[PDB]
Amino acid sequence: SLSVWTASSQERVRQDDPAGESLNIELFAARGEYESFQVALKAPEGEHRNVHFVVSDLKGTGDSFISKSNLTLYREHYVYISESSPQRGTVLPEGPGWYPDALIPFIDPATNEPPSGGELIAVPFALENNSNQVIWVDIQVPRDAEAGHYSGSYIVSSEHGEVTGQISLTVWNFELPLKPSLKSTFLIWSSRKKSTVEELLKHKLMCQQWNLSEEEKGAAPTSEGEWIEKYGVNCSGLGFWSKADTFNGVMPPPPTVEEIQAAASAHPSNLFLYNYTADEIGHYTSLYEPIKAWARNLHEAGVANLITMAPVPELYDDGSGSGRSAVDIWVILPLQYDKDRIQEVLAKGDEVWSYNCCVQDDYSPKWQIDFNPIEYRIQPGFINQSLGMTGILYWRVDFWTEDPWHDVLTLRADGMEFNGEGMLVYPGEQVGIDGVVPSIRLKAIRKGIEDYEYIEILKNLGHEQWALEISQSVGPDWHNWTKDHHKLEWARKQLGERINDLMTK
Ligand SMILES: [Mg+2]
C-alpha cells in the first residue's frame, strides 16, 4: 500500500501527517523563475524497502518542450529538535519534534551525476511504517521558454508499487531578470569554496566573505565578472570593517579616498558598490561624527555606506554640503521599524533593508527551523515591498554544529536555544559531495526574492499602487502578515496574471 500526495512549496509535511487528497500539481511561473512542489509518501501497511523516483520532460503544444534537465530533485532529511526556540507572543515555534530541512541531492552539481559513497543517499530509499518520506522538486523555467501550458509526470516505484502523478505548468509571457532587483548581503564565515558562493547565487542571494584572515583580506575578486554573467550579481562590498559593534563603541579614522578607490577598481565596472562599515552601534551617539567622516570618504569614491542601524536625523547629512545621508543603506530589524523616519530617508534617496535573527519580539516573522516555513519567504518579498525596503541582510549562512546533519541547535545564549540560527546550507560530506547543499528555508528565501521581483516589474510598468494594494493584503507590515501559504499563492497569482496580460497586449 503506497499512499502518495503533493504539497505546495511553503507547506511543511510532518513525518506523521495524514495523506492529502491530490497526487497532481498545478503551477504557474515566468521565464527565469523557479517553482517547486513536494511529493509526500506513506506506507500505511508494511514497508517499502527500495523506493525510486523519476520525472519526465514537460511537453506543451506543438514543439514546445522543457527538458527534465531543468528539474532538480532532493529527498528531504528530517532533523530532531529537542529544545524549542524561544516562545513569546503570538508567533510561536511548533514544538520539539522532527522537522524536514536539509535537502539530499539526487545529483552532485560538480559532476551532473548521482553521488556515490555518501552516508545519506537520496534514492533508492526505504519507506517505513507510518513515517512519511518527502521528495522536493524544483522546476526552473528556461529564459526562452514559450508561453503556454506544459504537462509531465513523476513516477514513484518500489518492489510492490508504482504510482504516477501529473505535473501541470503554465508559463506566463514575462521574464524575471537574471540580476535580482532585491539586493542582499549574506555572510560566509568558514566555507571558502567557490561552490558555497555559487549555491547562494543560484538561490538569488549575494554573499560576502567574513571573518577573513589578515592574509586573505584584500584578495582580488577574481570570479566576480564570471558571476555577474552567470548569476546576475547585483552588488559587492569593499570590506573596510571599522570593528565597531554592539560590544565595541569605538571607531577609527576612515581609509583614505585613495585606498577606497583602489579597492573599488579591483571590482568589475557597472557594479553597485557598498561598504559594511559597522554593526548594531545605534546606542553609541559618540560615533555620529566618525560615521560622517567615513561617509564623506566613501562618497568621494562613489561607494555606498551600509550600517545595521535605524535612521536617525543626526545622520541625514554627511557634512560634505551635498545633503547626502551619512548612511546610504540603513539595515533594520522588524522591531526597529519607524514609519516616519523610514519615509524621511526614502524621500531623500536612501535605501532601507531588513535583517532578522534570534526571537526578539512577539509579532515579526522569525528565522528558525521550528517556525512556520512561510516566515523565510514573506520577509524578502511582500513585507519588504509593502514597506519600501529594497534589500535583505543575514549575519551568517554556515554556522554548523559539530554534527550538522543531526544537531541544528546552532546557538545557545541567555537561557535560550536557537534552531538554525546562522545556518541555511549543510555540508556535502554526509551525502558524498564536496560542496554544500541547500535547506528548505533557503528555497523559501529564493521564492521571496522572486515575489519581490513580481512587484518590482509592476512598479516598472507604471503599476506601483496596484501592486502594493495586493502586497498590503497579505504582508502590510511586521505585525500583520498572513500565516497561510494559500493566501500568499493567491496574491502571487494575481500579480503574475496581471503582468502576463500587460505583456500580451
Ligand atoms: Mg529551552
Author numbering: 9 to 513
Sentences from the paper on this structure:
Beta-N-acetylgalactosaminidases (β-NGAs) hydrolyze the different β-GalNAc linkages of various glycans to modulate the length, combination, and abundance of glycans. Despite low sequence similarity, the crystal structures of these enzymes demonstrate that all enzymes share a prototype structure and have diversified their substrate specificities (oligosaccharide-releasing, oligosaccharide/monosaccharide-releasing, and monosaccharide-releasing) through the accumulation of mutations and insertional amino acid sequences. Among Groups 1–4 and GH123, the DE motif is located at the same position, suggesting that these enzymes adopt the substrate-assisted catalysis reported for GH123 MR-β-NGAs.
Surprisingly, Group 1 NgaCa displayed strictly OR-type enzymatic activity and acted solely on Galβ1-3GalNAc-β-pNP. NgaCa in Group 1 had the simplest structure among the enzymes analyzed. Furthermore, three characteristic tryptophan residues (W197, W218, and W249) are located in the subsites −2 and −3. The increased number of residues could potentially reinforce substrate recognition in Group 4 and GH123 enzymes. The anomeric hydrogen signal of Galβ-1-3GalNAcβ-pNP (between the GalNAc and pNP moieties) disappeared within 1 min for NgaDssm and 10 min for NgaCa and Galβ-1-3GalNAcβ appeared, while Galβ-1-3GalNAcα anomeric signals appeared after 10 and 30 min, respectively, due to mutarotation. These results indicate that NgaDssm and NgaCa are anomer-retaining enzymes, similar to GH123 enzymes.
